[PDB]
Nucleic acid binder design. Structure first.
Lengths: 237, 228
DNA sequence: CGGGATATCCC
DNA sequence: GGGATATCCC
């Protein structure tokens, strides 16, 4: 399927290559640093061609944002069906020891999920799927092309997975002032297998559309999945 | 000097795999920020060596500055260098938080704020204009996500404005002007002392700033008032 | 854990 | 001018 093939291509290309730097028209090569700002940029760029090709095999079109700060990284769809869109977002995080617990920031919880047309390419309801391509990496002179093998890398053991956002979503925020949804805090395996805490995508969306911004307000409402469900049981009170 | 030299030392089109496949750039700003920083590190390190200065980047991620230069002899004469980028279709940059290291000497900074003697800003300005990969010899067919790019070096305090560069992330806003004013260093502050005092007492929201000051005129009237 | 840092932009 | 975009830190 579009999805099986997408995961297949990503895992293959990744388990194969390694980006080692940026290159100028003149042929000079600048190495990379081990900050997630760099690696994020790198991993997003490394994925766009693959996404494009797979999207093409399945007759989908691929569109990116025209203005920045608008979700998602890639919007796929078929013209003959402009309402069943797929949202693909590439998220990155790191690890020092291999197979350690990781967590991702999964997007704002006061934007497009609350206001159908807020900071999003297309109105929220036009998408039927929200996929996250997560990358996990381990943190470890200009150059000539003929040197492409000696340039050192600021990363190791790069792992990647694709999973539906709601599935790997957690019940705790990923950020404070930037009010981001936090993912589950787990091993790479649970992400692949989709061992999340929500039962449905409606449960996911409800919990975050009502999540209070601060622990003080949440202390009155709910601070976690257990209290959310109790909150529901009582009649949202 | 170290400064004129770097000024003097001062067309990337993709990332490359050790294999040799060239992955293009996205026409965005988070991309170019990363690009421009990577492009700068070599230049800075080459010039730094010339002057017997050590270059240290951060270990922790949310730690200013991008680069710390210094002679192993004079460890309290450190220089802070930070790369900032903006785009053109007058411009403005975000110049760093005004609630961190400028109010708390050792907060989110590689070395205690008191050990730095200069805070330089290397600014890049680009004019914003392929989902295929390419090969080394195809470099001439890859579409660029930017039409032009200007760069400048300047002291942080000289190009600082009186309005915040961001709300929830509380950044210092630069002056809102032409590239030439940046290079000219046509600021609004009279000194680095005034720049620091203005941003040290800045309130986060407008309502709180409403009974203090929200611009340079107001700050000056507030000082005369006896800082209240 | 949650608040708030890192950089830059938009309604 | 407040709050979006991505991810991290203690």
């Amino acid at each position: 399927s579009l999805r099986s093939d997408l995961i297949n291509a990503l895992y293959d290309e990744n388990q194969k290559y390694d980006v080692c730097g940026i290159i100028s028209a003149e042929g000079k090569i600048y190495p990379l640093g081990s900050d997630t700002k760099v690696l994020s940029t790198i991993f997003e760029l490394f994925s766009r061609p693959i996404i494009n090709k797979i999207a093409e095999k399945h007759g989908y079109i691929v569109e990116e944002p025209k203005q920045q700060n608008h979700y998602p990284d890639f919007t796929l769809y078929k013209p003959s069906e402009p309402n069943k869109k797929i949202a693909i977002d590439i998220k990155t995080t790191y690890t020092n020891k291999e197979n350690e617990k990781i967590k991702f920031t999964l997007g704002g919880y006061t934007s497009f999920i609350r206001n159908n047309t807020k900071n999003i390419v297309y109105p929220f309801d036009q998408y039927i799927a929200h996929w996250i391509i997560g990358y996990v990496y381990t943190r470890v002179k200009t150059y000539n092309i003929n040197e492409l093998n000696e340039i050192p890398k600021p990363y190791k053991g790069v792992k990647v997975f694709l999973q539906d956002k709601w599935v790997i979503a957690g019940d705790l925020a990923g950020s404070g002032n930037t009010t981001n949804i936090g993912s589950i805090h787990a091993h790479y395996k649970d992400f692949v297998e989709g061992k999340g805490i929500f039962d449905s995508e409606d449960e996911f969306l409800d919990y975050w559309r009502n999540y209070e911004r601060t622990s003080q307000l949440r202390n009155d409402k709910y601070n976690n999945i257990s209290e959310y469900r109790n909150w529901i049981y009582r009649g949202r009170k």
